[PDB]
Amino acid sequence: PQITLWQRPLVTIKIGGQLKEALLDTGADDTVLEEMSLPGRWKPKMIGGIGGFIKVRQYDQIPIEICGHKAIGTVLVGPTPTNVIGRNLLTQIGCTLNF
Amino acid sequence: PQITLWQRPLVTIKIGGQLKEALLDTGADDTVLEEMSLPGRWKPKMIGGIGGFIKVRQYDQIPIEICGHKAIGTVLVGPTPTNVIGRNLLTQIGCTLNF
Numbered sequence A, B: 001p002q003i004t005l006w007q008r009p010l011v012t013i014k015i016g017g018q019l020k021e022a023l024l025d026t027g028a029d030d031t032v033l034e035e036m037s038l039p040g041r042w043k044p045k046m047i048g049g050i051g052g053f054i055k056v057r058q059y060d061q062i063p064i065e066i067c068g069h070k071a072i073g074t075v076l077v078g079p080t081p082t083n084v085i086g087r088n089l090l091t092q093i094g095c096t097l098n099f
């Protein structure tokens, strides 16, 4: 698809058996989702943005689907005010900026 | 151009006659730059990010070039960790997301 930027670029994702809404976010290195359960090992991480840092759990090798597009990658889980899909997953679905 | 997302989408901008580096950020509604001087009067704004909120100065109708493309619009100035070009100016330069 071609996604306009007149509005926030929100998409549905499928992850850990759940459907969630998330922002396609080229300014995010990492994918960060609100509190949820995921299987497997994790390690603590601090990530920083406008306003400072939050503590998250880092889960690696998590399957996700975005717009019919399957990918796998790291998902950070913690008290983000909004779900964001970061570059680590955007690359895997072939997402580019164009102008 | 077409910009992939394997690295941060950093570009050169020009504002007030000076070159700066900034991140093309589809997850940002607005454009926020690190401390700098701009002409005219400003208005207050709070903007919220991963770690909470910051106060910024809002300047309107400011000329800014982004990767050589001319825009004129609102620029926020404050203690952001990095210069970000948000959707307010991404739309002026005709930027879309594509996959």
Ligand SMILES: C=C(F)CO[C@H]1CO[C@@H]2OC[C@H](OC(=O)N[C@@H](Cc3ccccc3)[C@H](O)CN(CC(C)C)S(=O)(=O)c3ccc4nc(NC)oc4c3)[C@@H]21
Pocket: A023, A025, A026, A027, A028, A029, A030, A031, A032, A047, A048, A049, A050, A082, A084, A086, B023, B025, B026, B027, B028, B029, B030, B031, B032, B046, B047, B048, B049, B050, B081, B082, B084, B086
């Ligand atoms: C190295 C650090 F300290 C932090 O790294 C950031 C960048 O990569 C990491 O991935 C997740 C997180 O990414 C972001 O928070 N990205 C943000 C941009 C950013 C990049 C570097 C440093 C600070 C902010 C993000 O793309 C835009 N942000 C909103 C997202 C979280 C919904 S933002 O910076 O808080 C922002 C920017 C402009 C805005 N304009 C408005 N208008 C109401 O709200 C805004 C919010 C980590």
Ligand SMILES: [Cl-]
Pocket: A072, A073, A074, A088, A089
């Ligand atoms: Cl990853």
Ligand SMILES: [Cl-]
Pocket: A094, B004
């Ligand atoms: Cl590619």
Ligand SMILES: [Cl-]
Pocket: B072, B073, B074, B088, B089
């Ligand atoms: Cl504007």
